């Protein structure tokens, strides 16, 4: 399970029809400690008239990212690999219509 690891460390959010804002996710026990996550500005999307269109949806596009967590806790030299979901931006989708 253990390996040797060497350390070797666009206005879209505003211009999108599904705009978003970045939110600070900070964890001192994690590397990267700070992760900037996208949160969709509206439920709907922006139409050709520049207004919010309720019949389209701004949805966050999420991806699995690899993070290091101190193991055991508060140990600066020992870590565990973790997979977390982060929102990197938002997209505009036509909604799903539900019936039974």
């Amino acid at each position: 399970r253990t390996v040797m690891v060497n350390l070797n460390i666009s206005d879209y959010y505003n211009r999108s029809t599904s705009p978003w804002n970045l939110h600070r996710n900070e964890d001192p026990e994690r590397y990267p400690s700070v992760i900037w996550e996208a949160k969709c500005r509206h439920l709907g999307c922006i139409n050709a008239d520049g207004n919010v269109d309720y019949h389209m949806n701004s949805v966050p596009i999420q991806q699995e990212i690899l993070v290091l967590r101190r193991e055991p806790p508060h140990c600066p030299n020992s870590f565990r690999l973790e997979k977390i979901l982060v929102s990197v931006g938002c997209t505009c989708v036509t909604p799903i219509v539900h019936h039974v």
Partner: antibody
Amino acid sequence: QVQLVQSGAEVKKPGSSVKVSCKASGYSFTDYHIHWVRQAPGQGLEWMGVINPMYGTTDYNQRFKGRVTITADESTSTAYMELSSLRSEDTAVYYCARYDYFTGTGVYWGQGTLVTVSS
Amino acid sequence: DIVMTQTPLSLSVTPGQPASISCRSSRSLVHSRGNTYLHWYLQKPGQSPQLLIYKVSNRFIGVPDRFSGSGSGTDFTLKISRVEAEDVGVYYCSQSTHLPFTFGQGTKLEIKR
């Protein structure tokens, strides 16, 4: 079956903030939007805002300015509306409604919540 | 904000007699992808609004056929072929095409028994 239960009536002093809850059941909470609509005594209905419980994405009525905050808790199937800096004019019955894309409007409604703004 | 204007504001109808309510919006209620989000609700005092008609002309499950909807663009009409006692209340038209969603003033229906 499909059901929306709101929190009991409240009395708030001018300038305070009120938080009304809306407990959902009989369906998958995350799959439907929750809207909030109010009605001042002997007055018409007024749309306040909307939440997408799946992502927490919201849209508000500009008339209320930055006074309304709508939120939803996936784990307790409950949506909440928070109206700050209360005025006498904010005395009203507050409703929650779940909308859908087939009907295009609010089918299922909460019972209502009366909020009296008084010192 | 879209303005919804209802005519008349009040009505007193003999049970068995027909009733009609007009709804006119300040702008067309036709959506970019083709649907018309005009709906009709009935509200009984100290009760939540009940859905009567959705998308101009569709009756909601459980709504008797005495209720009917018609119209296009900015002018819409709710018709009741035979008024019944259970019909007492305030009727509202509502648009869900444009944000913020809006309702009419409401029309009060009184039963002339």
